[PDB]
Enzyme design. Sequence first.
Site, PDB file in Angstrom:
ATOM      1  N   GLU A 134       5.550   2.145  -3.232  1.00 38.30           N
ATOM      2  CA  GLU A 134       4.296   1.701  -2.581  1.00 38.30           C
ATOM      3  C   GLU A 134       3.503   2.921  -2.125  1.00 38.30           C
ATOM      4  O   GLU A 134       3.826   3.513  -1.103  1.00 38.30           O
ATOM      5  CB  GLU A 134       4.620   0.789  -1.392  1.00 38.30           C
ATOM      6  CG  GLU A 134       4.928  -0.633  -1.827  1.00 38.30           C
ATOM      7  CD  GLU A 134       4.879  -1.709  -0.763  1.00 38.30           C
ATOM      8  OE1 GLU A 134       5.556  -2.761  -0.946  1.00 38.30           O
ATOM      9  OE2 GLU A 134       4.088  -1.510   0.166  1.00 38.30           O
ATOM     10  N   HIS A 180      -0.409  -4.910  -0.860  1.00 37.68           N
ATOM     11  CA  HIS A 180       0.418  -5.229   0.339  1.00 37.68           C
ATOM     12  C   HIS A 180      -0.477  -5.732   1.484  1.00 37.68           C
ATOM     13  O   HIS A 180      -0.651  -4.985   2.478  1.00 37.68           O
ATOM     14  CB  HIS A 180       1.305  -4.013   0.687  1.00 37.68           C
ATOM     15  CG  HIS A 180       2.411  -4.331   1.641  1.00 37.68           C
ATOM     16  ND1 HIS A 180       3.043  -3.361   2.386  1.00 37.68           N
ATOM     17  CD2 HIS A 180       2.897  -5.511   2.073  1.00 37.68           C
ATOM     18  CE1 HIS A 180       3.911  -3.933   3.207  1.00 37.68           C
ATOM     19  NE2 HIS A 180       3.856  -5.250   3.015  1.00 37.68           N
TER      20      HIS A 180
END
Lengths: 302, 303
Positions: free
Chosen positions: A259, A277
């Site tokens: 991420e 996210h």
Amino acid sequence: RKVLISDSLDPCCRKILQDGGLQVVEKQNLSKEELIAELQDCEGLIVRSATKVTADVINAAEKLQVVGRAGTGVDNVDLEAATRKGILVMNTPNGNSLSAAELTCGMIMCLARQIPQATASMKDGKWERKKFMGTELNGKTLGILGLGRIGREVATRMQSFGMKTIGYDPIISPEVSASFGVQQLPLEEIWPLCDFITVHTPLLPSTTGLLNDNTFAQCKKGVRVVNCARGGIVDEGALLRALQSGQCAGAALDVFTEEPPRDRALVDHENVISCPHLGASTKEAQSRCGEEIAVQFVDMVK
Amino acid sequence: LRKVLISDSLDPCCRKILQDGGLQVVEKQNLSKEELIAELQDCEGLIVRSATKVTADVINAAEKLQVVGRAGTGVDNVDLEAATRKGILVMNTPNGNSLSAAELTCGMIMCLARQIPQATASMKDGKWERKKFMGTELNGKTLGILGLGRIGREVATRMQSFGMKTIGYDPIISPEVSASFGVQQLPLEEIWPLCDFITVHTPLLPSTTGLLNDNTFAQCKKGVRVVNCARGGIVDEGALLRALQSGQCAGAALDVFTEEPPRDRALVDHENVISCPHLGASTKEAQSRCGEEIAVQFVDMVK
Ligand SMILES: Cn1c(C(=O)NC2(c3ccc([C@H](C(=O)O)c4cccnc4)cc3)COC2)cc2c(Cl)c(Cl)ccc21
Ligand SMILES: Cn1c(C(=O)NC2(c3ccc([C@H](C(=O)O)c4cccnc4)cc3)COC2)cc2c(Cl)c(Cl)ccc21
């Protein structure tokens, strides 16, 4: 008696802290050495997902008594290094659930009807009503893996669309799952009944690669999958091949192994709905988190 | 009254139930106007989806055409004036659709709250902006449903489960019956300012055309969000455009347009507009129920 907020957090956090009666330092996108130097006379530290509380940071912070996280989980704090220096790690377990549950139901609908695909198509100036054919949720079967708070909020919502909510969770008894309309079964019996599967578990060894080449093969041909929990609960590699084969009809991902993600194989696939996210990306939630964390800090100052 | 032609991509089960009833059928597709007329020259019936357009010219070149069925709700692709002139019957399938439309609607609302389509187009371009795409928690927010018909109440019971306030307006259904599926009814002038979200589920009428216009939009909460999954123009296209540009409207979701497909590509192209090529009845589940319900009506009148 002195805290540091190292990330973009709702104003109300800093307020309730000073309101409680202790100094605060709102800083942002700090560098590792810049962080340590700032930390050198701070008893507390509060963080979002940006700041990474490494081994090195904790050991360079001679005064650091407590590390709060305004979110769900602590996947950005070295717990081994934390417990070693007797440090407390604080969490915001309630104030985020709802936001995550909604985005999840979003995904399921978005998957059923290809709303994001149709927008990207229309936006490119295309009228493809010949073939964008989706699914009626009514009477379909959704599989929820992880009957925590988020899992049951997802279940009660998708119930109202007339979906069967079967699921699995090794902590919660069939008696309590049933009490929010999720009937529980062993995993091996769930895969073939599902037209849709979502996952709502923390990332553990018992959970890692829960969907893999082997489970995916036991699923209904054209099952559809939503990961809004943690990256890798659904094996990224495994899914990719399930979409390519058609074993998986489409997938929705809010969370990745890296991420932000380097492996841009999935995102780019035409049947993958994706988000950077956003499960906790709501003014509503971050205030409830930011509020609930600042409380916990002041609560123990007596 | 004994030979039909299906001119569109229609569920197999239509042709079945027709022959099952006991009359010849001809499954064809993407036919040209002159190709259609020539094929039609010994067919008593014609069944169509939204693709085929039964123009003035077609009906008058079809000396034997007794009946025209449509697998869907509405017949805005059949000249009714030209139809009634030659004593032709026009049939449709008003039921088998409600649920599909209600779901896509709730899709839109979520999609609007969290910008799912915008995030995909962004991620798909290889971009991670989580600092940017702050959305809304539906819990405790107010949805305004204009048109408490079948679709309207299905939309209400679903979005209730997310913990939304469902206030609405419909002049046909009584406050007593609306209340009975958790929609509190209010006069329009009192609805605009309470709503964070408004969806419309009414037929196209003059009393309803431009229901959202420069004037209503202005009495709405700053940053209201709007879903048209019913008929093109219930929300004035021009009016919305200016509401997005001003920020009076925070974003919009459209399944239906004035022109289909739309020439005015001002709205679709706006960054806060979720759009779909009329997919409200685009589900295998529905088109089968339609295709089934139409083929019934044809056989029903053969005895
Ligand atoms: C430890 N565990 C759990 C589990 O942790 N369940 C419980 C749970 C409690 C709280 C949550 C969290 C929550 O719902 O708040 C949660 C949801 C999603 C992502 N991250 C955290 C999730 C699960 C229910 O009591 C604990 C599910 C689970 C599953 Cl499905 C497997 Cl397959 C293997 C191990 C598992
Ligand atoms: C005629 N009419 C109606 C009306 O017809 N209401 C009822 C209704 C029944 C059925 C529908 C249809 C339905 O819900 O299936 C419908 C929805 C969307 C598009 N086309 C048809 C719509 C409305 C509720 O009982 C009848 C509402 C209404 C309103 Cl809100 C205005 Cl403002 C002006 C004229 C109106």
